[PDB]
Design an enzyme around this catalytic site. Structure first.
Site, mmCIF file in Angstrom:
data_model
loop_
_atom_site.group_PDB
_atom_site.id
_atom_site.type_symbol
_atom_site.label_atom_id
_atom_site.label_comp_id
_atom_site.label_asym_id
_atom_site.label_seq_id
_atom_site.Cartn_x
_atom_site.Cartn_y
_atom_site.Cartn_z
ATOM 1 N N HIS B 347 0.776 -1.232 0.000
ATOM 2 C CA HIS B 347 0.000 0.000 0.000
ATOM 3 C C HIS B 347 0.810 1.287 0.000
ATOM 4 O O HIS B 347 0.208 2.361 -0.095
ATOM 5 C CB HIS B 347 -0.934 0.055 1.214
ATOM 6 C CG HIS B 347 -2.077 -0.906 1.140
ATOM 7 N ND1 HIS B 347 -3.287 -0.578 0.564
ATOM 8 C CD2 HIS B 347 -2.197 -2.183 1.578
ATOM 9 C CE1 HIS B 347 -4.104 -1.615 0.653
ATOM 10 N NE2 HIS B 347 -3.465 -2.603 1.256
ATOM 11 N N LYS B 538 -8.679 13.640 4.543
ATOM 12 C CA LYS B 538 -7.732 12.532 4.494
ATOM 13 C C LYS B 538 -6.860 12.690 5.725
ATOM 14 O O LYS B 538 -6.830 13.779 6.309
ATOM 15 C CB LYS B 538 -6.868 12.550 3.226
ATOM 16 C CG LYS B 538 -6.144 13.882 3.003
ATOM 17 C CD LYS B 538 -5.432 13.950 1.641
ATOM 18 C CE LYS B 538 -6.428 14.020 0.458
ATOM 19 N NZ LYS B 538 -6.426 12.770 -0.380
ATOM 20 N N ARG B 539 -6.162 11.630 6.129
ATOM 21 C CA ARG B 539 -5.288 11.715 7.292
ATOM 22 C C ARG B 539 -4.229 12.800 7.094
ATOM 23 O O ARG B 539 -3.742 13.022 5.984
ATOM 24 C CB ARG B 539 -4.632 10.354 7.538
ATOM 25 C CG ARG B 539 -5.619 9.280 8.002
ATOM 26 C CD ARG B 539 -6.180 9.596 9.386
ATOM 27 N NE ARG B 539 -5.131 9.601 10.397
ATOM 28 C CZ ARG B 539 -4.854 8.589 11.214
ATOM 29 N NH1 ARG B 539 -5.561 7.468 11.198
ATOM 30 N NH2 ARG B 539 -3.834 8.701 12.063
ATOM 31 N N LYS B 544 0.771 14.239 1.991
ATOM 32 C CA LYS B 544 -0.506 14.617 1.399
ATOM 33 C C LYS B 544 -0.616 16.123 1.191
ATOM 34 O O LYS B 544 -1.523 16.569 0.470
ATOM 35 C CB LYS B 544 -1.669 14.115 2.273
ATOM 36 C CG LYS B 544 -1.778 12.567 2.342
ATOM 37 C CD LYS B 544 -2.923 12.124 3.251
ATOM 38 C CE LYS B 544 -3.017 10.603 3.453
ATOM 39 N NZ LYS B 544 -3.582 9.900 2.241
ATOM 40 N N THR B 646 -8.156 6.577 -2.396
ATOM 41 C CA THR B 646 -9.547 6.209 -2.650
ATOM 42 C C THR B 646 -10.505 7.349 -2.365
ATOM 43 O O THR B 646 -11.596 7.367 -2.943
ATOM 44 C CB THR B 646 -9.968 4.996 -1.788
ATOM 45 O OG1 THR B 646 -9.660 5.269 -0.430
ATOM 46 C CG2 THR B 646 -9.242 3.714 -2.207
ATOM 47 N N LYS B 650 -14.090 8.670 -4.384
ATOM 48 C CA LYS B 650 -15.369 9.046 -3.781
ATOM 49 C C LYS B 650 -15.841 10.402 -4.286
ATOM 50 O O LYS B 650 -17.023 10.584 -4.606
ATOM 51 C CB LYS B 650 -15.244 9.063 -2.252
ATOM 52 C CG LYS B 650 -14.890 7.701 -1.665
ATOM 53 C CD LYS B 650 -14.492 7.814 -0.199
ATOM 54 C CE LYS B 650 -13.665 6.624 0.237
ATOM 55 N NZ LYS B 650 -13.233 6.816 1.660
#
Ligand SMILES: CC1(C)c2ccc(C(=O)O)c3c(Nc4ccc(O)cc4)n(-c4ccc(O)cc4)c(c23)C[C@@H]1O
Lengths: 805, 805
Positions: B347, B538-539, B544, B646, B650
């Site tokens: 992952h 998101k985390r 990110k 992901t 969405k």
């Protein structure tokens, strides 16, 4: 099958099977292909519990609408046993479920054996609480049992190498179908912190919070449509590095983790103090909320709080704390309310049982309660000083504060000061309270002191555990006795009735075969069913004198070896009960019992004339099996030490004859039946006192009794422990030099009284006739009678056995 | 109400109300007088769960009868969210329950808000597991999710003083109506101990036992009558002073206490290693028992084990341990079985995520597993040496054993060696695996390496969370797309259809009003519903690049202050997500977001033209609320760092346009829709590499970009923390000197791309037409497509969307 078990109506059975199958499908998510007997037990339990729900809701609504005075029975212990059979009995569902499960191919008695005991007590005090809940519901009282939902009850006892081993009693492993969690009613309990005095008054601040989550269990009255509540609190961490902080939630939740297994012994463990305050604080919040959902003048008219021993004694300063600090009542008004609300039941005179908490522990954990306790003490001692001017020693003796290296609070003194009623649990005990250990308090406030002789519920302890005996009784006198047990006196009319004599003996023989089958099935132990079942079951303590029984057992063995050709009544001597984990002497006594058995049970000269067996893991469900099978009930505590006893009453109700001292409720049992119908032996309280006055010298008995001397030499020399010759030197040394309970002083009378027991057993007809005279007079010892007295003489409510609609 | 929600049949509604009321009465033990909304939620949940039971039993019986190959999805995380709406959707019960509860006077959506998320995961990996369970049931696979029933899921995040605070996620407080405890299926798991080598072989002895108790939760397929199982293991102390020993049972039970909240970061905590072995050991016992209830030749024909990351990598040596030590298979045969049974999904490429357990920790906790791992390594490296003779560096690089001060086992290398398939989670990521970090393994065994681009279930992520959008789609193309999402391409026909354009925009506006109502109701936060909803959820991680979003937000603010009179598209910029408790930089980034808001949201020159809000406690249920309301989807990780994503999918499915880098599955989303329909910006992987090759110098960007320089000086000088001027010096210092993710290097392209976003939003028709082109091409990202590929290309089973009877 038998009429006392009710009707198996055709539609009732059909509906039961449907609801069984619905639960199996929707609740257990099984179909019959894979379902285990435990699945079946749980499907039946849910089906039976469903039959309580309507009455449970309507009972509690009824109390809300009629606003009767509510009774709060506060106890650290509810020794409930199993619930499935009790519920069916009290709902008149037993034959219907028996037939329904039979038609499904299931043996309901097999299913019943799958239920875990709710073993939330140690012994007499906790089982009294359980019987009381049953009787208060049967008597229509608006009564609530409040306690702790221990994750682990009294430890499961295993005997390994003849020794007790303790294992966690994981009674909730497969769930509890009876209880209803009420997480929406969760309440905060506070610990530690400190007291601020502001303009408003005192303020308890900087506390640590533990949440108390209530779980409600239904308490069905006997076929009166009443279902009361037992509310047990579970500890939960409050909602507000990271991983350790989450794991450390366990520390607060340990408060409700496990029952302290000390039967009659105070150890001032902080965690136990936390448990006691936990129950008290959450319960009194409930009580006050319910009271406000009806000014505190009327509070004692609407609330009775009954303290089961000193364990919830903190209710007295907690109620003061709430009334003064939060409701802003004046101290004197709050105290008037408190004393009129609270009453205290004392269960033992043994000094080592008295709760005497160190002041520094109270100051740290409950700083505001210690302040209130000091204020209570000052005002109470002011009253003492005014009533007895100049009696300074009385002031020191009565104080709630006990001086010494560790200053302590005497919780019994707190209870007396803060309660309008104080009661012992049998007539002789309640008098001893007024005469000795509470004499000072009795002289200040004689009106406070009462007796409430204990009792047992005849539902669990006759109809449930001995349906055969309940049936032959009902065949003669009807079923009214089941909640009117004094009607058993009608059975005295049948003492010369050949049919009843036959039936009484037949029932006892069936119970003995059933218990022998239990021991074979569960332990591969073989007992001679044509022997006298001589049973002593109760917690292991020196004061209960299992050791005296041991001495007699060895006497029987030694007399057999001396005259092998002489006939003796065959006996199976059974002893069972748990020892507290840290009580060395009690654990040694268990080992002695099994060690005696190891010699006796394997001596070919003895054969099946004498066997000695230690019944493993004695608990409520096992009491229900062995007590109906007993011929002889051993109740042999040193006179003055057993406050009441209740196992004595169970045996009497179930057709055993009693060998015992004039102690506790033995005295009243013998009074009710006639002393000619009891095997009473040994010192009376007065004789014990005379021995204490001159000094108990066990050596004198050893010197004068050859048969006793022989037994002590066998214990000393290793006859009962050849591989470890001095294994029992501590028992010998205690007996010879440090015996607080005077075992030797009753040895001779006991052995001779036991001879009279055997002599009567050789005459089966007269044994059985004497049994009838016992069963017929056991009615006084129904806990309905006990509860009726509490209601009228302490709580101020009138019982009623009338049906709810 | 709306057709995609099914029929409210008259008898169905009548039966639902009856069963609701039965549960309220018999299950909740309430009548309507006292029932709380939570009581109502639980009555509905039980009623809905009852509708699963028949199919659940018959599905599992069907698998027993037909013996298909069984798929075991092993994961430390199942990020399930709530279950009530999902169950109703998948059972076609949603309108019926809506009508039934409405007729009872209840708002079913209000009841739904009472359910706790099953928050048993951190982010993408755990939510992938949840989507996969749904898709495997919808595709008729005999599939089982196996994990841990954590008592506490991912922590509940509170923002206090603009800072993250963590609280325990006590999701089981009021119970879980969905799960079925199976304490009868409890299994022992072993820890510590030591290895004996006897004549039989090796023996793992002297272990400490932890019991694993399974809880089964139903997994309904979409209207195909399939109900699969998620089995989550709970730690329980084995059955065999006293009080502390009982309390110490907590230590073993802590194994399942709480989810480790590290998203993309390995910390070698022993307790986490215990959790990983716990799932593995109990699960493989289940797998083997089920296999034997059908010689191990056929085992890979009947069992697939899918390893979700390296977290359950111990399955590989545990399966070897069972096959060799307990089943007595030869090593080579056991290894052939193992590799053919196991497959491994990777992952992330971030090195700090790789599990590298110290050898001494493995030796202590799992001594036999370390022996097996060493043997695996020797044999594997022998194969490497034979394929690449003399390549010693390759031997060192590929070894399962990593040398250093602490010797460690590389669990990724173990997974590759012990698995017949290795897959990344998006095309670009799976190629990177073959090109870089697993290049050596790819060269040895190229056939092993696959791609399985991630996806999301269109049940939870469209029909459930955005019924309005699902309806307007179904009105045009029917309902088949709900399990055949590639049919959304039919919507490209409607790109010039005025009615559909109107409806798409109308649905988005309704969702935005609904989310604004949520924020007002739950937090008293007011957002301008006529603003562009710019959402990054998101985390929180540096890779990110929430910080890049922060820089853009301050740019918008500074440009407004520079030219207050110039029109700009109003924005509500929303950022949400959890930071791992020990990740200082991530917590500082949250504080910066709220600190920016504190200035921006209160500047009267700004008004409602720009607002910056941190969405508290981002979790699956909140994603279902905010994603359908989003206009702009922020997917701005540094190229090469986000394996797939992901959340990106969405947003695409729910009618937001995407601003993002060519990273992870962004690449394939842009390929599917056409790059002209995505706001792609920034460095590509190749450009990142060129910067690394010459050295990333953030100062050069600071020196050349006045607007960036202005923002950094505001952060440094305290403009966003006047009361603590150097509050953000660590962020500034990281950006200027230690930025592994090259924030500044994408600043200019991002700001200019954001301008293009605003320019399109000023044209509502063309914004909406581009939205249609995204929704219409999101079909590839259905997890049904992903699962179908796993089934055919790894597991060797053929999916099927046909109904069970
Ligand atoms: C009204 C009555 C006669 C009845 C009829 C039919 C069903 C059915 O489903 O066909 C019933 C369930 N269902 C049912 C039974 C078990 C279950 O787990 C779920 C639903 N329960 C019921 C019983 C206990 C409960 O905690 C909840 C409902 C009751 C049911 C109670 C009652 O006896």
């Amino acid at each position: 099958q038998i009429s006392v078990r009710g009707l198996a109506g055709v539609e009732n059975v059909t509906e039961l099977k449907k609801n069984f199958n619905r639960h199996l499908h929707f609740t257990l998510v099984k179909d019959r292909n894979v379902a285990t007997p435990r699945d079946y037990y749980f499907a039946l339990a849910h089906t039976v519990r469903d039959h309580l729900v309507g009455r449970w809701i309507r009972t509690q609504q009824h109390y809300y609408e009629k606003d009767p005075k509510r009774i709060y029975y506060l106890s650290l212990e509810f020794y409930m046993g199993r619930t499935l059979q009790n519920t069916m009995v009290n709902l008149a569902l037993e034959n219907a479920c028996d037939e329904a499960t039979y038609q499904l191919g299931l043996d309901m008695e097999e299913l019943e054996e799958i239920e875990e005991d709710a073993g939330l007590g140690n012994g007499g005090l906790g089982r009294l609480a359980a019987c009381f809940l049953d009787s208060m519901a049967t008597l229509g009282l608006a009564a609530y049992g409040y306690g702790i939902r221990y994750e682990f009850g009294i430890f499961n006892q295993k005997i390994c190498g003849g020794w007790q081993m303790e294992e966690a009693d994981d009674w909730l492993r497969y769930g509890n179908p009876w209880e209803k969690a009420r997480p929406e009613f969760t309440l905060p309990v506070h610990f530690y912190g400190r007291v601020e005095h502001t303009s408003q008054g005192a303020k308890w601040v900087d506390t640590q919070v533990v949440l108390a989550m209530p779980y409600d269990t239904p308490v069905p009255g006997y076929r009166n449509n009443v279902v009361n509540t037992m509310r047990l609190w579970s500890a939960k961490a409050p909602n507000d590095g990271y991983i350790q902080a989450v794991l450390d939630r366990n520390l607060a939740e340990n408060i409700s983790r496990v029952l302290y297994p000390n039967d009659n012994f105070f150890e001032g463990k902080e965690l136990r103090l936390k448990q006691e305050y936990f129950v008290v604080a959450a319960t009194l919040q409930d009580i006050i909320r319910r009271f406000k959902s009806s000014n505190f003048d009327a509070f004692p008219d609407k609330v009775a709080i009954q303290l089961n021993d000193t364990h919830p004694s903190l209710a007295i300063p907690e109620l003061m704390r709430v009334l003064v600090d939060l409701e802003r009542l004046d101290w004197d008004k709050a105290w008037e309310v408190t004393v009129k609300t609270c009453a205290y039941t004392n269960h033992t005179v043994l000094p080592e049982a008295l709760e005497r908490w160190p002041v520094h522990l109270l100051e740290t954990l409950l700083p505001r309660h210690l302040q209130i306790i000091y204020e209570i003490n000052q005002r109470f001692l002011n009253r003492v000083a005014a009533a007895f001017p100049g009696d300074v020693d009385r002031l020191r003796r009565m104080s709630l504060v006990e001086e010494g290296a560790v200053k302590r609070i005497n919780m019994a003194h707190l209870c007396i000061a803060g309660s309008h009623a104080v009661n012992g649990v049998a007539r002789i005990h309640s008098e001893i309270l007024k005469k000795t250990i509470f004499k000072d308090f009795y002289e200040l406030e004689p009106h406070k002191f009462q007796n409430k002789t204990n009792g047992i519920t005849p539902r669990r302890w006759l109809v449930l555990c001995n349906p055969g005996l309940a049936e032959i009784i009902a065949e003669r006198i009807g079923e009214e006795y089941i909640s009117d047990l004094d009607q058993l006196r009608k059975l005295l009319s049948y003492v010369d009735d050949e049919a009843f004599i036959r039936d009484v003996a037949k029932v006892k023989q069936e119970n003995k075969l059933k218990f022998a089958a239990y021991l074979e099935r569960e332990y591969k132990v073989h007992i001679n069913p044509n022997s006298l079942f001589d049973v002593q079951v109760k917690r292991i303590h020196e004061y209960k004198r299992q050791l005296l029984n041991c001495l007699h057992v060895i006497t029987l063995y030694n007399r057999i070896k001396k005259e092998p050709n002489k006939f003796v009544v065959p006996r199976t001597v059974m002893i069972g009960g748990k020892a507290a984990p840290g009580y060395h002497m009690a654990k040694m006594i268990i080992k002695l019992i099994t060690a005696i058995g190891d010699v006796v049970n394997h001596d070919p000269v003895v054969g099946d004339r004498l066997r000695v067996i230690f019944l493993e893991n004695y608990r409520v469900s096992l009491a229900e099996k062995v007590i109906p099978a007993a011929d002889l009930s051993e109740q042999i505590s040193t006179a003055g030490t057993e406050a009441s006893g209740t196992g004595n009453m169970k045996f009497m109700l179930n057709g055993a004859l009693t060998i015992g001292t004039m102690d506790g409720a033995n005295v009243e049992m013998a009074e009710e039946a006639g002393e000619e119908n009891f095997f009473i032996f040994g010192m009376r309280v007065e004789d014990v006192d005379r021995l204490d006055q001159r000094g108990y010298n066990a050596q004198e008995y050893y010197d004068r009794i050859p048969e006793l001397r022989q037994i002590i030499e066998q214990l000393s020399s290793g006859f009962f422990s050849p591989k470890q010759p001095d294994l029992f030197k501590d028992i010998v040394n205690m007996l010879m030099h440090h015996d607080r309970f005077k075992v030797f002083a009753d040895y001779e009378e006991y052995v001779k009284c036991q001879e009279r027991v055997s002599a009567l057993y050789k005459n089966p007809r007269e044994w059985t006739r004497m049994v009838i005279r016992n069963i017929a007079t056991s009615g006084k010892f129904s806990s309905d009678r006990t509860i009726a007295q509490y209601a009228r003489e302490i709580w101020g409510v009138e019982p009623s056995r009338q049906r709810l609609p």
